[PDB]
PDB file of C-alpha atoms and ligand atoms in Angstrom:
ATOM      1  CA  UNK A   1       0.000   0.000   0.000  1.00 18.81           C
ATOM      2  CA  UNK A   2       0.821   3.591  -0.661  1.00 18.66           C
ATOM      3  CA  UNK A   3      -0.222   6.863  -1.258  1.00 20.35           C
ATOM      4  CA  UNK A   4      -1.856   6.575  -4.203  1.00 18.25           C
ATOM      5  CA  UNK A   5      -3.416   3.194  -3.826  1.00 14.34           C
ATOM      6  CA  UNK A   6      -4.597   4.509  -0.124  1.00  6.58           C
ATOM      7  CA  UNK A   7      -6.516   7.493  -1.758  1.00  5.20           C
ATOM      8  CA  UNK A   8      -7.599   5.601  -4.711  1.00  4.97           C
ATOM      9  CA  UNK A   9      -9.681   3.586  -2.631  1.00  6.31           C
ATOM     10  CA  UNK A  10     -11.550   6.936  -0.030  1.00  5.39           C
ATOM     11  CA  UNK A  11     -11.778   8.566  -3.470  1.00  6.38           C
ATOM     12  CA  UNK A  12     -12.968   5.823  -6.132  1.00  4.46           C
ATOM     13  CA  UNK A  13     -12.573   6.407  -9.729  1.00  6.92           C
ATOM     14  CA  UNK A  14     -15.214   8.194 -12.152  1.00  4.62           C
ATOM     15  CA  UNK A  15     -14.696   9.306 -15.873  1.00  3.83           C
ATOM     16  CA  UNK A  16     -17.634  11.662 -15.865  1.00  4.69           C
ATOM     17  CA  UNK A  17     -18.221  14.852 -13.904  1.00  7.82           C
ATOM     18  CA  UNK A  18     -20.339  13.855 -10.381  1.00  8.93           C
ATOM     19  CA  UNK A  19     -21.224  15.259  -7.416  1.00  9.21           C
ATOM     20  CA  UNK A  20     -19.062  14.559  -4.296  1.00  6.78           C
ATOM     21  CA  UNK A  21     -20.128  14.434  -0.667  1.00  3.36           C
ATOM     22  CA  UNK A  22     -21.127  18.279  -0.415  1.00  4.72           C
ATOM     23  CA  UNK A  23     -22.736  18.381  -4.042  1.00  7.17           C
ATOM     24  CA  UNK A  24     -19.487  19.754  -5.850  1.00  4.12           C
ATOM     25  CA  UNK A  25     -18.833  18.674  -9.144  1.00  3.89           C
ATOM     26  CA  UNK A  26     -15.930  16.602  -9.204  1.00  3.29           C
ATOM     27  CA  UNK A  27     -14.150  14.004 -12.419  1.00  4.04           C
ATOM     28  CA  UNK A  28     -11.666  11.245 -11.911  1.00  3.91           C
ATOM     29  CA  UNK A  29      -9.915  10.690  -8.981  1.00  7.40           C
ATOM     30  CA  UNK A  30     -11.322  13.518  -6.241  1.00 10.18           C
ATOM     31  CA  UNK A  31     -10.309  15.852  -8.153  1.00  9.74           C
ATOM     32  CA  UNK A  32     -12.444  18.669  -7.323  1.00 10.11           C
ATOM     33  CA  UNK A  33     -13.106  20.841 -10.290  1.00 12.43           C
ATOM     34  CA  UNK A  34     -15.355  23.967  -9.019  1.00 14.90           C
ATOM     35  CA  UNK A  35     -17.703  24.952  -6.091  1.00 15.98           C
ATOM     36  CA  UNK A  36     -20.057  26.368  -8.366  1.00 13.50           C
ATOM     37  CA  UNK A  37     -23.323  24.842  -9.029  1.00 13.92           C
ATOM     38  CA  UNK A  38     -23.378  25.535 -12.770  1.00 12.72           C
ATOM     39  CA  UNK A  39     -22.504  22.414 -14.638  1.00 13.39           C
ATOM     40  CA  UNK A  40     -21.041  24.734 -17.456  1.00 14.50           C
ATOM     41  CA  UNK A  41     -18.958  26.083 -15.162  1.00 12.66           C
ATOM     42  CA  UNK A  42     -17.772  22.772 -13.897  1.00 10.10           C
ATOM     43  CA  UNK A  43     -17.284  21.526 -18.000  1.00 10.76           C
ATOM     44  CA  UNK A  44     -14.989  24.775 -18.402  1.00 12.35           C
ATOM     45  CA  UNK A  45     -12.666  24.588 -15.814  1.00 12.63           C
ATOM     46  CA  UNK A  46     -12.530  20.367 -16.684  1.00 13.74           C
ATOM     47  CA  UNK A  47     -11.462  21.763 -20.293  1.00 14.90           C
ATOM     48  CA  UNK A  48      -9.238  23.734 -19.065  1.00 13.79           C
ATOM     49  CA  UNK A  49      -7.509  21.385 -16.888  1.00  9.87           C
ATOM     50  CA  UNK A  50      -7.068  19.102 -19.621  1.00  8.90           C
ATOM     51  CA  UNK A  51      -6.417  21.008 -22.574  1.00  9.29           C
ATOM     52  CA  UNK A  52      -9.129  19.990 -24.974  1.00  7.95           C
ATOM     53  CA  UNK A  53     -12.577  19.818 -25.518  1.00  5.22           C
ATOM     54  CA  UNK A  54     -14.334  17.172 -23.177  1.00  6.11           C
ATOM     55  CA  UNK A  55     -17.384  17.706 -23.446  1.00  6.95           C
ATOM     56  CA  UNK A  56     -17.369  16.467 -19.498  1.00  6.36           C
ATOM     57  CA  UNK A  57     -16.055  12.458 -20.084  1.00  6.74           C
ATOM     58  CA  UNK A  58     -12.039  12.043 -19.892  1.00  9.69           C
ATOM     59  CA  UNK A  59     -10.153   9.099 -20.289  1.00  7.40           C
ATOM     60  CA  UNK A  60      -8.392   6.903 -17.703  1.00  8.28           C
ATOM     61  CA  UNK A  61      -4.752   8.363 -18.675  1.00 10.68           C
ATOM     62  CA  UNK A  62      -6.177  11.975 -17.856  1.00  9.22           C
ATOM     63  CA  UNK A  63      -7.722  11.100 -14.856  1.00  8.94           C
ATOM     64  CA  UNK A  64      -4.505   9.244 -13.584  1.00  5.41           C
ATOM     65  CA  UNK A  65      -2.497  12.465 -14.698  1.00  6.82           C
ATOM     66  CA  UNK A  66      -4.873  15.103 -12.555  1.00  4.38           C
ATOM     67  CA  UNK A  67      -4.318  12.184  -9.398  1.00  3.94           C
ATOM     68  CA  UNK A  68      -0.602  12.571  -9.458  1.00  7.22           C
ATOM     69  CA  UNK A  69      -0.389  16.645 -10.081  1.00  7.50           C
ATOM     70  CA  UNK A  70      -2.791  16.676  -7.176  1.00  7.53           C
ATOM     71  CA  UNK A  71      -0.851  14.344  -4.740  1.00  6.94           C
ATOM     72  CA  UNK A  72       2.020  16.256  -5.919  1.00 11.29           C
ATOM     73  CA  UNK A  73       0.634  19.702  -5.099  1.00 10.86           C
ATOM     74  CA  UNK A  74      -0.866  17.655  -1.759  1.00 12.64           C
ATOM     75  CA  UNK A  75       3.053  17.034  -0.329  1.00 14.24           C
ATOM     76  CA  UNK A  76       3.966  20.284  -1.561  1.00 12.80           C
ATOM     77  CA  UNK A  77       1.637  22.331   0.008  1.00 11.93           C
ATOM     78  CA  UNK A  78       2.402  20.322   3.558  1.00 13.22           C
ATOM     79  CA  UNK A  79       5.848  21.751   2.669  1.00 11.72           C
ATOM     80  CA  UNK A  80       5.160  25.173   2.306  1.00 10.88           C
ATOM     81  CA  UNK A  81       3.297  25.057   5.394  1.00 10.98           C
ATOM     82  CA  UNK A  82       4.241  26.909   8.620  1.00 11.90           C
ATOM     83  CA  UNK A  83       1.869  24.229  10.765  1.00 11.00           C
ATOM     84  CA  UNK A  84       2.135  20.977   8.570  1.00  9.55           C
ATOM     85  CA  UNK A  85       5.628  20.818   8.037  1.00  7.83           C
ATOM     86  CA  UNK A  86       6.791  20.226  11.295  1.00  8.12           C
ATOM     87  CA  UNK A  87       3.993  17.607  11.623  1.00  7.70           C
ATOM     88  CA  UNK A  88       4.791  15.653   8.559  1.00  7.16           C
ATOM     89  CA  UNK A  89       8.445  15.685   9.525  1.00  7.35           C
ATOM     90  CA  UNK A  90       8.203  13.865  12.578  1.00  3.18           C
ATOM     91  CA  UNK A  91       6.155  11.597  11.917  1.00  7.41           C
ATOM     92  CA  UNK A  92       6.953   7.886  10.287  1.00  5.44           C
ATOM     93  CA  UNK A  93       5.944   7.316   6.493  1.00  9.08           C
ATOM     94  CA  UNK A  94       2.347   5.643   7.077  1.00 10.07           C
ATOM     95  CA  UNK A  95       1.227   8.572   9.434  1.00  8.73           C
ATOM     96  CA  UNK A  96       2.396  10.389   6.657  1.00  6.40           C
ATOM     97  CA  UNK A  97       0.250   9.134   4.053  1.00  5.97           C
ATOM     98  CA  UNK A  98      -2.494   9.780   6.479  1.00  5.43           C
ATOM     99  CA  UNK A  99      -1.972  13.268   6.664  1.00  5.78           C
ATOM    100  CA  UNK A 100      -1.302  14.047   2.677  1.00  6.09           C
ATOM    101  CA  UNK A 101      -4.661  11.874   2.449  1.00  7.75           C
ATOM    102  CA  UNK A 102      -6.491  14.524   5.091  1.00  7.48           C
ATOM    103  CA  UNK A 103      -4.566  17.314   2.994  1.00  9.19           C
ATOM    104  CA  UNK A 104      -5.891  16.168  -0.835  1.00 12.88           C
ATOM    105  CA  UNK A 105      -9.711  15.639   0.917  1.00 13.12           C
ATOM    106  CA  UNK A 106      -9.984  19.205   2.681  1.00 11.47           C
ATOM    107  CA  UNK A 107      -6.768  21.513   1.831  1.00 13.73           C
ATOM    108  CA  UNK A 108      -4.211  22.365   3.763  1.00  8.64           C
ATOM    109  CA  UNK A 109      -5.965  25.304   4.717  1.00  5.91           C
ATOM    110  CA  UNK A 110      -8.868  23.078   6.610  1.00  8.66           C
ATOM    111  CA  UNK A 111      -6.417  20.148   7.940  1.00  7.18           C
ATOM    112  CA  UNK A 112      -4.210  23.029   9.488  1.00 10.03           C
ATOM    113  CA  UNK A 113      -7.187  24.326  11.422  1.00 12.48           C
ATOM    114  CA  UNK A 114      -6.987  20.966  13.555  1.00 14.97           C
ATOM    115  CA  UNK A 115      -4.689  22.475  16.215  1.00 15.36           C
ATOM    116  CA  UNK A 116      -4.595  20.036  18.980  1.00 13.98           C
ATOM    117  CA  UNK A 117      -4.855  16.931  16.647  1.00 15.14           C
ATOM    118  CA  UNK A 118      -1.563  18.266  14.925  1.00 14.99           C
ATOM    119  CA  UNK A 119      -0.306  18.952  18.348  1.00 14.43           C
ATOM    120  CA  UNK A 120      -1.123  15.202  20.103  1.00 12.67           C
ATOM    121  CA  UNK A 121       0.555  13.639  16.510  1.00 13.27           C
ATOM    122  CA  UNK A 122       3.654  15.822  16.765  1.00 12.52           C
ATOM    123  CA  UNK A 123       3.849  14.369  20.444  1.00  7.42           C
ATOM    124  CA  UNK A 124       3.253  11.227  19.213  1.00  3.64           C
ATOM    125  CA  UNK A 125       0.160  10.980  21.964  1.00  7.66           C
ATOM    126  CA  UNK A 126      -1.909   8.322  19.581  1.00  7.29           C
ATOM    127  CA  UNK A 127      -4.738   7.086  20.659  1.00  4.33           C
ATOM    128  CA  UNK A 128      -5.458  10.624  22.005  1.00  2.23           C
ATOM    129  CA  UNK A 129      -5.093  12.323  18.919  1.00  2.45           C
ATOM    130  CA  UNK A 130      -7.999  10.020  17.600  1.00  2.61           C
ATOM    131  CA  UNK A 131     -10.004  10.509  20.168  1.00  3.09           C
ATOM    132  CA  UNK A 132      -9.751  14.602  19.427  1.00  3.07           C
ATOM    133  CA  UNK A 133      -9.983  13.723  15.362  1.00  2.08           C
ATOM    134  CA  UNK A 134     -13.013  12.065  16.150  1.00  2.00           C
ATOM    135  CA  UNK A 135     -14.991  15.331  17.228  1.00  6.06           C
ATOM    136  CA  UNK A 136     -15.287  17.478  13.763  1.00  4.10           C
ATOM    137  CA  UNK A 137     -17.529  17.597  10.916  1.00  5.19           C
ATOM    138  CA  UNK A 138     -15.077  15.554   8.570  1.00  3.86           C
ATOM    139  CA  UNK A 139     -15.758  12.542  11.124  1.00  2.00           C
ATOM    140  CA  UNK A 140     -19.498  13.190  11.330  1.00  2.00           C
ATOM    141  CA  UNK A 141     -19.653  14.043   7.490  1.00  2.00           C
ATOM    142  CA  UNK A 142     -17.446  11.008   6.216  1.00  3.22           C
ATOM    143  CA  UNK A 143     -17.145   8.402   9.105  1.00  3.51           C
ATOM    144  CA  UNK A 144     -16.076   5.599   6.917  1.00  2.00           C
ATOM    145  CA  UNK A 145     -13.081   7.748   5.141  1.00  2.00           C
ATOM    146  CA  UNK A 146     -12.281   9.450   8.284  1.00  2.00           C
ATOM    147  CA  UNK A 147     -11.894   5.916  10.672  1.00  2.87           C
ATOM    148  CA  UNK A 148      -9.796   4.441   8.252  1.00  3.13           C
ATOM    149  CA  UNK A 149      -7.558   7.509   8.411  1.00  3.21           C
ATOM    150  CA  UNK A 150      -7.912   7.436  12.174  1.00  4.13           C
ATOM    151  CA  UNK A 151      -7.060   4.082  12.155  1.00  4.95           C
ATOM    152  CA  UNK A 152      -3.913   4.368   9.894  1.00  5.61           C
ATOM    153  CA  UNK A 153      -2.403   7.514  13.195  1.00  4.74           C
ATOM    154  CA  UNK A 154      -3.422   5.436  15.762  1.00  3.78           C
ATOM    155  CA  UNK A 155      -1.907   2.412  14.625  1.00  3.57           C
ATOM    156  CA  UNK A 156       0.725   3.244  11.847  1.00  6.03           C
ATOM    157  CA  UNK A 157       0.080   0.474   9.616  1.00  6.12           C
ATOM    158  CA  UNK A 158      -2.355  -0.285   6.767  1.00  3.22           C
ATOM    159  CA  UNK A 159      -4.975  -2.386   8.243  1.00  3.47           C
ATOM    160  CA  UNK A 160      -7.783  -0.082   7.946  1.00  3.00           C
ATOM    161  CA  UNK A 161      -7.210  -0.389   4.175  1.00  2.00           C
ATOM    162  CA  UNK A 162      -6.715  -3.963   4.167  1.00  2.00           C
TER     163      UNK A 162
HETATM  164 CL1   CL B   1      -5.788  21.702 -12.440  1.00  2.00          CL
HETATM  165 CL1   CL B   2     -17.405   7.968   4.464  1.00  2.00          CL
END
């Protein structure tokens, strides 16, 4: 297991634009394409993320290509940030996928907003910082997504996914 495989299976695989938990249209592999509700909207900015005409369907190559600019852009952004970085760097490399799989789902913007969760992980304090994970909307809003990600910092290993 990796990455990749990890979020392949929270984020499933569709070649036409869909909805995603909150009603945003989304193609591929999570990748989210706009908040607006206008379908046309959503077909425009897939267009332009692509570079040709879709007509909203893309092929499996295109949707593998958005996944790894946006897993990419995932570890990156954890990088550039003030409050992740130090996370991410002390912790082992299946926490890590946990956290880069938090970061693709909600931005680095919302995961960074979990103060004392990033605070029990960097302390290594792990069933605690599940416990505290546990109490937010991403829990209430995704509970099967967000206890297999739970699982994977309290335990460090892939069981949840296996
Ligand atoms: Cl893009
Ligand atoms: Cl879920």
């Amino acid at each position: 297991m990796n990455i990749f495989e990890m979020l392949r299976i929270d984020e499933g695989l569709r070649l036409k634009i869909y909805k995603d938990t909150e009603g945003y249209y989304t193609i591929g592999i999570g990748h989210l394409l706009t908040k607006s509700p206008s379908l046309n909207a959503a077909k425009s900015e897939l267009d332009k993320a692509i570079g040709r005409n879709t007509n909203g369907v893309i092929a499996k190559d295109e949707a593998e290509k958005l996944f790894n600019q946006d897993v990419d852009a995932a570890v990156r952004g954890i990088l550039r940030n003030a409050k992740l970085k130090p996370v991410y760097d002390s912790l082992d490399a299946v926490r890590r996928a946990a956290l880069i799989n938090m970061v693709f789902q909600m931005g680095e913007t919302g995961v960074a907003g979990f103060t004392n969760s990033l605070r029990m992980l960097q302390q290594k304090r792990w069933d605690e910082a599940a416990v505290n994970l546990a109490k937010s909307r991403w829990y209430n809003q995704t509970p099967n997504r967000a206890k297999r990600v739970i699982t994977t910092f309290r335990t460090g290993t892939w069981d949840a996914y296996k």
